[PDB]
Scaffold this active site. Structure first.
Site, PDB file in Angstrom:
ATOM      1  N   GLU A  48       7.720  -2.457   7.977  1.00  0.00           N
ATOM      2  CA  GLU A  48       6.515  -1.765   8.408  1.00  0.00           C
ATOM      3  C   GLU A  48       5.663  -2.759   9.172  1.00  0.00           C
ATOM      4  OE1 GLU A  48       4.747  -0.065  10.018  1.00  0.00           O
ATOM      5  OE2 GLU A  48       6.138   1.504   9.248  1.00  0.00           O
ATOM      6  N   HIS A  80      10.971   6.197   4.137  1.00  0.00           N
ATOM      7  CA  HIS A  80      10.708   6.093   2.680  1.00  0.00           C
ATOM      8  C   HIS A  80       9.934   7.307   2.152  1.00  0.00           C
ATOM      9  CE1 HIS A  80       6.538   6.128   3.133  1.00  0.00           C
ATOM     10  NE2 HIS A  80       6.200   4.920   2.759  1.00  0.00           N
ATOM     11  N   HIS A 116      11.096   2.587   7.604  1.00  0.00           N
ATOM     12  CA  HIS A 116      10.088   3.658   7.651  1.00  0.00           C
ATOM     13  C   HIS A 116       8.760   3.234   8.268  1.00  0.00           C
ATOM     14  CE1 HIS A 116       6.171   5.177   6.740  1.00  0.00           C
ATOM     15  NE2 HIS A 116       5.940   4.043   6.128  1.00  0.00           N
TER      16      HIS A 116
END
Lengths: 230, 230, 230, 230
Positions: free
Chosen positions: D86, D8, D179
């Protein structure tokens, strides 16, 4: 809601004359029968069946497909995966559950698959009694299909897809046949037992079973075997 | 690549003693047999089968499921839809293909389904010989499930899904059983005939057939019936 | 339950300086804005959005994708098809909605697309202003992608998938953006109008709309445009 | 073939003023930009992108969605899962990567997430800085959604779906944004590193990367960052 836990029949390989495997080799007459019986069981008794899953194998399927024809359905989506099989034997095969036993004998025969740190010896790609990439299988990181396989790691085969795919719809009715250990696997993690438990409840093929659960899939209503006396 | 065009058996309703319908009521022994035969046919002869589709019905399924068990597969994804059935009869049912015939007789018996502007009379929701929302069916704009149904509009049932879903993978091997008219339907639009054609080629159940095609799905290599003498 | 009927923006081709097409060529600033606005609308006003569908095109998508980011979601499955586009123009393109008009003028300009038996002239495969098999498109019987296209046949693009796929889940919340005519198409068949109707309600891009329906998807609760004064 | 590994931007929470989490809270301007940049990168440089996957979150999506609009696609299937996020922080949140640090300081701040046996403290259901069943999430054995979460177990989130779903098509082009750690995760298991490795390569958001692989997905052709000097 509904967990339909069905353990095929007895194939027609190992069973009958000792051998068998993760190999995938149909099943004898008891299958069709026992299966049809089970098929007979879900319906006849009561209930019906919304969604069905199979460890991409003919053996188990036979069992599953049959029940459906007799209950009086056959019609419905169905889902086939590779996270639902019999714990890959090791490096044996054929054997006969005699010479093998005759040879090492001991917990070795009994223990091998069982708990851990000792599944059957692996398996090379130079024994017709393996299982690699029969078409199908190669729509999966090839860096997968096991080698020895236990009902432990097996937990994972069960785990990801369980929460992911089925666990998805189960807000309704669905059935995942499998057998031998998968089902053990399904319950084993599911109930109490404790890795050292299960190891003592093969489970009746043919017949069929339901868990019941609710929201957070913890088995409220106990377990019914249609034929408790089966 | 592969078009596997299979026309079930002869159910066990209409057939035997005249009646039957879009109703969905299994099939006799010839099915299993003829089907197994067909199943026997694809494999034994040659080829195998990558993907399978069924008009959400037990009848046809029986045929399809069986072939697979004998060829030696059973294992594979499978797709069930409601765009693959026998042209809904009209307002008859039971009949016996006698009194009906005996009654009106004429092209009426013959013509009814056939071409157009005269499918069998519709069908109300007060005759056990309809087909509405047996679970399943109600995962579709209810404002669907027909009423009379011809192999014409039927073209559409065939059309959307054909190009859409299967037509998608067919860059490989896939099989959509169905029967009676669907298959007629598949070929009818597919080949030449001409709405007035087909009307004269019921198609052999049991056995199985392949078109071949290529890219833009126009049948290059002709059609093989495994048993041309079947 | 929920029908979210959204007509993109005004692209940035035809619009602005007359031309545009089924071609697929993004959209100007109003899009992002109006779209974001609409996105603003569903959420801010009320409601949220469970499932989303797009006529495999960047233009419309921009509109759809944006609304979602602002309402405060973005997260969800999404489904992309080729049964949701702007009625393929004919053999024009560029034009400028002037010389074309200037040339033939009359109902010709107005009528062309409109009703039937006269969509824009077809379109050959030797004009960069067509649309054939940009990857994607060739996962569909190639014997498809139209040529001229009207909002009539267009009905079908709308029809099959509508009852089939979305119509499936709509037992919940889902949104299929599209625009220009699709949405007209969605409502046109949906409501009353009558083939000769619609032809007179372009529909406000940016903003967003809900039908409400129930079971048999007939619009109970009327239609809300978030901004009736938009 | 193609692995598009994209991290990201920097959201707009933690980043900027220290905090952030598995929470799911968009991202600032750099995102759109850097993302658009990356989007710019895959296309402009070369290549295009067949299939896309997101850890059911708006943050990452923004990044992913944008790249696509600029390269010049936007059109394509897309797949959203919950196996791509995440690493859930622990019991912190807000913090500010100061007082927390200021408080315990030491490897504690650094180590917490990192390796194992010490992810951030869990997390109760009485802190707005958790993540439980925001719709979505409850189409998964509720007995899932973690609590603390590390990039270790995280391996599994990555593992099942990786081999299962994407690993399926990857016989073509597909992109799974994610990400922070997921991507680390993707490579970490993928390459060498060694659990103690990775821990030292955050990875450039915005930009985008490709692995190349082949059949048994072991990275033949090394890794390209479009902007090695990024």
């Amino acid at each position: 809601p509904k967990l339909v836990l069905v353990r095929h029949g007895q194939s027609e390989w190992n069973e009958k004359n000792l051998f068998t495997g993760w190999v995938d080799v149909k099943l004898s007459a008891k299958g069709q029968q026992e299966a049809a019986r089970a098929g007979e069981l879900l319906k006849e008794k009561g209930v019906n069946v919304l969604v069905d899953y199979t460890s991409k194998l003919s053996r188990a399927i036979q069992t599953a497909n049959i029940a459906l024809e007799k209950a009086d359905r056959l019609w419905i989506p169905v889902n086939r995966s590779w996270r639902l099989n019999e714990r890959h034997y090791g490096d044996l095969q054929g054997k006969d559950k005699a010479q093998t036993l005759k040879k090492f004998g001991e917990e070795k025969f009994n223990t091998y698959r069982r708990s851990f740190d000792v599944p059957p010896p692996p398996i090379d790609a130079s024994s017709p009694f393996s299982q690699k990439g029969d078409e199908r299988y190669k729509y999966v990181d090839p860096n997968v299909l096991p080698e020895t396989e236990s009902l432990a790691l097996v937990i994972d085969r069960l785990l990801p897809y369980w929460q992911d795919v089925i666990a998805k719809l189960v807000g309704k009715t669905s059935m995942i046949a499998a057998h031998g250990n998968s089902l053990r696997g399904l319950v084993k993690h599911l109930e109490g037992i404790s890795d050292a438990d299960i190891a003592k409840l093969n489970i009746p093929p043919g017949t069929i079973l339901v868990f019941e659960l609710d929201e957070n899939l913890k088995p409220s209503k106990p377990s019914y075997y249609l034929d408790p006396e089966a």
